[model samples]
Target chain A: PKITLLTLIKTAEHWARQDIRTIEDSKLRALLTLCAVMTRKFSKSQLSLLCETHLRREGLGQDQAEPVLEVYQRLHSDKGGSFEAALWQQWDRQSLIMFITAFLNIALQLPCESSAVVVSGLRTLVP
Target chain B: PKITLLTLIKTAEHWARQDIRTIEDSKLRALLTLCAVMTRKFSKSQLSLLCETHLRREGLGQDQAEPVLEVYQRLHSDKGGSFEAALWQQWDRQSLIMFITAFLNIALQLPCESSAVVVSGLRTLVP
Candidate 1:
């Protein structure tokens, strides 16, 4: 079936929950909830701090933390309004929505080495 | 193993020939061969015309032709050398190589309705 924004959101939420559920830390559940919700609202630097703290607590290195940090930076960094407008003109709305949300899901769900790899994969996609 | 440019090109050629081999039109085989080779060399407009003619003869419509046209336009329309340079700085060489060639494979192999859908899917990915 063709993917729609709604389907993309549903899929991401489902996937995020599945992956997050695998975490054995009951305490981190509250933190994950806070992070996922705040991810949409936080500024670049704020989210970077949030993610850095979490990654460090999880014992992930700078190598893992950097990819996640880069994504937030890119997302918040202003491309000219014209550039974003041109992008939407060139891309299908649903497809763009799906990809953006899917990347967000993958990024928010990153809590381990394998998940950091997903962040690195998304780094290639930002352009 | 990491996907390099060489591997991606080899894989695309292998996959394209595999799919195109199923075409019973012996005459179109020559066209496919020419198209593949010319795809890299052709100007955006030139490639659009080439794709439009083949797609039309294959009984496809503007729906299919438009996606192929847009991709060529995007690729050839300069994004500014600095933009491209910045992109390479952020993305890993191997990962970028794989995504690009994989996209080309899907685009060139688009000869049917199902394939046109792949083109539509890729429309979202261009950004």
Candidate 2:
């Protein structure tokens, strides 16, 4: 669960960087940046992850969690995989916002098995 | 002709800076910047001024040169009229493009009297 959270953060950061580079509009880019900041840390928490996936199912036809899972798999298997800490650090606030948006878009699709880990984080909340 | 040219350049620069602040898109901003560079000096040259005004008439419903004359009048009447050289020099490339666009939008409508000055520049083109 802890590792999954890290993976999700990384994946989101990746996507956010991409989005920032791609979108050239100042207003929309600023909006996306805002979204990322509000959502990033909240996204790592189990409840937020569940909520995102639930929303994704209702809004989009498919659960988007598959990509996060894929990244999680890669991170575990590929020892030589670069984490790009500098790249992530260098990212502007707006870029992080986009990354969070991207990560949640997929994390929302956690299916059943993967979501179990996230759900456990929710269960641990009860006394 | 020399004074009119100065007035036109100032008017355009003012508009371009405004446009830059207005539009928040990066790609469009960059494009406008490119247009400004290619167009700025060329715009000062006689042929470009005439062509820009000519295009303005066909594209827009009216000629737009009245604003330039207004500014020109202000510059003449107002001894303390701030010719912000620093502000003009501080403008980014993109800002100039938008300013040029704004200037030409009005310049194209030079009517008859105001346009006489701009047209003289064109006449001087011939041997």
Candidate 3:
């Protein structure tokens, strides 16, 4: 297995192409891998729930983290009621956060004209 | 500028590192770029709304798309309240869809064990 961050990112790229057919953007695929790594490191549902919840909030209606609570609950059924057992065999909190931030940052600023505005928007969101 | 899908994605990757911060996932970043391109190509707030909506849905509460709708409305200000003018200067349709799907697929499936379950979950969601 790859032992470094760059290798892992490259591995993420490779897997994205072969298995993740549904994922089109290479950058986004890399982000996903980063999330996976984080999920593995921490073995917590907070981040996963954070991502899914926020995404769903913007997609569906409102910003409440209750509706999808059940999904996370059901996520690690094989490992008792603990989400950590299945999630954090290889947890790395900082790495996970870093990866997520990278994906969001790049994504919001792909187009030139769009970049300035998007960056401004993100600054608002992050702050 | 390069006149191909690959180049656009690549350009997105390059810009992501330089601009978008907080986002760590390269693949998701790529997806973000794809969204930017799509947002640019179609000039419609629906797709952007769709992405933010669902992501927030799973992240925050039950799936609903309203609070964010207002954001979409607010999206186009400079062009006499036209989201399209601000979003879609050079639009491309199918390409956008292809890119979105690609990111989702890769994202849900990066780790092997994660891949199998993620795919199954998506199948349930899509079906």
Give the number of the best model, judged by DockQ. Answer: 3
Per residue, candidate 3 scores C-alpha lDDT tens digits across A1-127 of 3122223334444433342324444333334434333233211323343445345534544443453343233432323214433333344544334434443332222222324433343232221
lDDT of 3 by residue, B1-127 (tens): 3122233434434443343434444333334434333233212323343445445534645343454343333442223224434334333434333334433332222222223333333222121
> What TM-score does chain B get in every candidate?
0.31, 0.28, 0.29
The order of the candidates by DockQ, greatest first, is: 3, 1, 2
lDDT, candidate 1, A2-106, per-residue tens: 322222233335544443333333322222322232243232325565557655555667887776565445434423223334444566545444334344454
TM-score of chain B of 1: 0.31
Candidate 3 TM-score for chain A: 0.28
Candidate 3 displacement at residue B124 in angstroms: 25
Candidate 2 error regions (>4 Å): A1-24, A41-43, A47-58, A68-127, B1-127
Q: Candidate 3 chain B, which ten residues in sequence have the lowest lDDT sum?
A: B105-114
Separate DockQ for every predicted complex: 0.01, 0.01, 0.02
Candidate 1 residue-wise lDDT, B1-98, digit = tens: 32221222343455444433333433222223222322432323245655565555446677877755654444344232233334345655454443
DockQ of 2: 0.01
For candidate 2, write residues A9-105 as lDDT tens digits: 3433444345444444443333332222223222122334445554454464345456434333332222221322332455676654544455445
Among all candidates shown, the one with the greatest TM-score: 1
